Amino acid sequence: RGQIQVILGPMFSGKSTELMRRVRRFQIAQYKCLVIKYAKDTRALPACLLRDVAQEALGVAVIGIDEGQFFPDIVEFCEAMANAGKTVIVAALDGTFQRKPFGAILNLVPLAESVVKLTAVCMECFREAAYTKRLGTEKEVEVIGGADKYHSVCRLCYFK
Amino acid sequence: RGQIQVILGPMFSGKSTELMRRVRRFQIAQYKCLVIKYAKDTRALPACLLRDVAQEALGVAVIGIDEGQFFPDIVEFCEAMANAGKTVIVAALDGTFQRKPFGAILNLVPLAESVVKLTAVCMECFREAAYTKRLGTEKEVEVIGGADKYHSVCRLCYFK
Amino acid sequence: RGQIQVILGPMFSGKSTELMRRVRRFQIAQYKCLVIKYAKDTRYSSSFMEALPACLLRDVAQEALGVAVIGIDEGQFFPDIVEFCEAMANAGKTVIVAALDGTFQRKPFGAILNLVPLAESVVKLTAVCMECFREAAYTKRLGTEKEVEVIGGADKYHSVCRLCYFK
Amino acid sequence: RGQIQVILGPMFSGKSTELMRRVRRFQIAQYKCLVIKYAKDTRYSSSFCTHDRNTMEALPACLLRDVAQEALGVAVIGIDEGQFFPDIVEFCEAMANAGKTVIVAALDGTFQRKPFGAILNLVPLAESVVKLTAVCMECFREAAYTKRLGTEKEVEVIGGADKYHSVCRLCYFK
Ligand SMILES: Cc1cn([C@H]2C[C@H](O)[C@@H](COP(=O)(O)OP(=O)(O)OP(=O)(O)O)O2)c(=O)[nH]c1=O
Ligand SMILES: Cc1cn([C@H]2C[C@H](O)[C@@H](COP(=O)(O)OP(=O)(O)OP(=O)(O)O)O2)c(=O)[nH]c1=O
Ligand SMILES: Cc1cn([C@H]2C[C@H](O)[C@@H](COP(=O)(O)OP(=O)(O)OP(=O)(O)O)O2)c(=O)[nH]c1=O
Ligand SMILES: Cc1cn([C@H]2C[C@H](O)[C@@H](COP(=O)(O)OP(=O)(O)OP(=O)(O)O)O2)c(=O)[nH]c1=O
Ligand SMILES: [Zn+2]
Ligand SMILES: [Zn+2]
Ligand SMILES: [Zn+2]
Ligand SMILES: [Zn+2]
Numbered sequence A, B: 001r002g003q004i005q006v007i008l009g010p011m012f013s014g015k016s017t018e019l020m021r022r023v024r025r026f027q028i029a030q031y032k033c034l035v036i037k038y039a040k041d042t043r044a045l046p047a048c049l050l051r052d053v054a055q056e057a058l059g060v061a062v063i064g065i066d067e068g069q070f071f072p073d074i075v076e077f078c079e080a081m082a083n084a085g086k087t088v089i090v091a092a093l094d095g096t097f098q099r100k101p102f103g104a105i106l107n108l109v110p111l112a113e114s115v116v117k118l119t120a121v122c123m124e125c126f127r128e129a130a131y132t133k134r135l136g137t138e139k140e141v142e143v144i145g146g147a148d149k150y151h152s153v154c155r156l157c158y159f160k
Numbered sequence C: 001r002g003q004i005q006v007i008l009g010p011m012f013s014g015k016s017t018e019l020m021r022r023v024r025r026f027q028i029a030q031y032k033c034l035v036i037k038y039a040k041d042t043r044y045s046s047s048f049m050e051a052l053p054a055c056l057l058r059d060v061a062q063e064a065l066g067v068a069v070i071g072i073d074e075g076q077f078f079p080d081i082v083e084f085c086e087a088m089a090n091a092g093k094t095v096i097v098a099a100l101d102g103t104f105q106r107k108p109f110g111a112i113l114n115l116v117p118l119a120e121s122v123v124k125l126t127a128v129c130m131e132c133f134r135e136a137a138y139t140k141r142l143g144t145e146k147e148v149e150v151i152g153g154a155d156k157y158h159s160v161c162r163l164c165y166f167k
Numbered sequence D: 001r002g003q004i005q006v007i008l009g010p011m012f013s014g015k016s017t018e019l020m021r022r023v024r025r026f027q028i029a030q031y032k033c034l035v036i037k038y039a040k041d042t043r044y045s046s047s048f049c050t051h052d053r054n055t056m057e058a059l060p061a062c063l064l065r066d067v068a069q070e071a072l073g074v075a076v077i078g079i080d081e082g083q084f085f086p087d088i089v090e091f092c093e094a095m096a097n098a099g100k101t102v103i104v105a106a107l108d109g110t111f112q113r114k115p116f117g118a119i120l121n122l123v124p125l126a127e128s129v130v131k132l133t134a135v136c137m138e139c140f141r142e143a144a145y146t147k148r149l150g151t152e153k154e155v156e157v158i159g160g161a162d163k164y165h166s167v168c169r170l171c172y173f174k
Helices: A015-028 A050-058 A074-083 A105-111 B015-028 B050-058 B074-083 B105-111 C015-027 C057-065 C081-090 C112-118 C162-166 D015-028 D050-055 D064-072 D088-097 D119-125
Strands: A003-008 A033-038 A045-047 A062-065 A087-091 A114-117 A131-134 A150-153 B003-009 B033-038 B045-047 B062-066 B087-093 B114-117 B131-134 B150-153 C003-009 C033-038 C050-054 C069-073 C094-100 C121-124 C138-141 C157-160 D003-008 D033-038 D057-061 D076-079 D101-105 D128-131 D145-148 D164-167
Touching: A003 A015, A003 A074, A003 A105, A015 A033, A015 A062, A015 A087, A015 B015, A033 A050, A045 A050, A050 A074, A062 A074, A074 A087, A074 A105, A105 D119, B003 B015, B003 B074, B003 B105, B015 B033, B015 B062, B015 B087, B033 B050, B045 B050, B050 B074, B062 B074, B074 B087, B074 B105, B074 C162, B087 B105, B105 C112, C003 C015, C003 C081, C003 C112, C015 C033, C015 C069, C015 C094, C015 D015, C033 C057, C050 C057, C057 C081, C069 C081, C081 C094, C081 C112, C094 C112, C138 C162, C157 C162, D003 D015, D003 D088, D003 D119, D015 D033, D015 D050, D015 D076, D015 D101, D033 D064, D057 D064, D064 D088, D076 D088, D088 D101, D088 D119
Parallel strands: A003 A087, A003 A114, A033 A045, A033 A062, A062 A087, B003 B087, B003 B114, B033 B045, B033 B062, B062 B087, C003 C094, C003 C121, C033 C050, C033 C069, C069 C094, D003 D101, D003 D128, D033 D057, D033 D076, D076 D101
Antiparallel strands: A114 D128, A131 A150, B114 C121, B131 B150, C138 C157, D145 D164
């Protein structure tokens, strides 16, 4: 009945597109669905904490979460909802700009029925990209931005 | 450099969404992209024959083809473009409503670097679905339409 | 339920290994399994639950009827691949097929691709290109034989990418 | 050039078979290969097969550093049971950054469905990550987890289907 699926990848790999592909497959079969997005990324409920939308999620069969890395309560929420019989689909970055685990996201992997890591195209050499390189000098993890602030990159380009 | 990727599956499995996900990964990395759709499905560039858009395709790096099953020249076109260095990504039904090969699309498989078959949700029992059942009694292969005319189904529901 | 899974790819892509991985997953969970291999392929690397050589899948239908999971190696060489898989899946067996999608000419190998529309699961594995070492999707024949069926391994064939193929 | 590939899954999902499928693809194309196994897992079902012994280096270890010299001499390195190597991250990154293809089979989770050792730190480092499924040994649906049958509390308890079942979420929780 209930499950957690995780869609990992670097930026620009289409994780949110894959999330919506999966959600729509259920939606066309008449399942009730909810998608949650992280509220501070303004580049289908916005939220900063998943507990903020837990009431609405009780009333659906399928929950999609975009930018899962930003929710500090990702684990508790996904596990509770999957154990209550919901299908929970999470798109998230696996790694920060430092190729370190992004928040609590990887704690989901041992809890998950399905895990995939998508690839992007390296913006610097056009081979396949598994990582995200920050272009500026900000040292904090959370810096909202797109291709003006980040490049998807392969290993060689990450370290160039 | 050139290649053919094929995205197979029944109706309602999100083939065209996956096509666009893959194409957009190249587009954001500044490749020139062209997408082609079958002109008679009205429910990028429309076409009934790929030869008609061959010129525009010569001028891009990445060509996506939606509803590839409907193009009678799909094999010749994809092979020529890939052999000219283009990445050709094709979304198509693998089977008709009779679970027979749809057009010439399966002749791409031995030519292709990548082949995947997506699944839909069975609209009748909600297990995974690999096939498309026609709801009405029309016998002709090409009948354009959505969930009002077809259901994604599993094997058991396909056979009643 | 009743399913067909198809594992495609060129030579040297580990199709037979993937087939056995999938079968063993069921076997360890106490399912009765049978693996069928093409009897004319007597290569050592393509040896060795019930495990049975056949030239026609019908020839071991009696054994196949009494199991839950049937793996078939080198699907492309069985004249009855389509009919057998479909009948077995409709009888409730899980049928897992490893096969070449393409001949040395990159044309469909027998009737194998007619399984695709009947199948719940289809993947195409990759090999390593034996000529440039990028990923390979095709098999190139090394000698001048013109007939489709020539049994052999890396002695007679290479896995290749598109550029090396035409090379 | 170099890369890390990770094959996750519960027990009985065929992770070491997938590892060997991947490594053999390179071996048959004449790459020099080494496969490393965790020395303390002495089960018959986990031992190197004879054909692999004859075509690649196959080495037991309890620390990856202990086979670093051998690993430096090859192009492709496969690691079975990567969760048990405390230096998994350092080794895999060093080797991939020196041009090697590193392929790791590992459990993602312990019997408690918590991260197994340091293994998930590879995920952000890896070019490729898959999670395989097993068959639930209790209800026969797809299984993503491993349940311990006994009452042992320690994470590391070597054993097979006699001590562990692959299970789905429902069977995991009883
Ligand atoms: C790599 C990285 C990204 N970010 C930010 C940048 C973006 O605002 C955001 C990207 O999150 P994503 O999860 O990549 O957003 P998305 O769901 O749109 O992904 P996709 O394009 O694949 O569909 O996270 C950080 O704050 N810190 C980082 O270290
Ligand atoms: C099965 C079948 C479909 N069709 C038609 C119906 C549709 O108009 C068309 C299917 O287009 P698709 O793009 O395959 O349908 P879809 O939009 O549901 O696909 P997806 O979600 O996977 O992207 O093919 C036939 O004409 N004959 C048939 O045998
Ligand atoms: C390509 C090709 C192969 N063959 C033969 C050669 C082999 O005997 C047989 C292929 O069997 P496979 O099982 O495809 O060969 P393999 O063992 O290398 O594959 P894998 O690593 O994926 O398990 O087909 C032909 O007869 N004609 C052809 O055109
Ligand atoms: C789940 C779990 C396993 N182990 C042990 C048991 C085994 O000795 C080892 C796991 O071996 P694996 O190779 O993960 O198990 P397997 O041989 O069933 O795997 P596969 O079919 O995927 O190839 O780890 C623990 O110590 N703690 C745990 O919590
Ligand atoms: Zn690069
Ligand atoms: Zn159904
Ligand atoms: Zn090549
Ligand atoms: Zn179960």
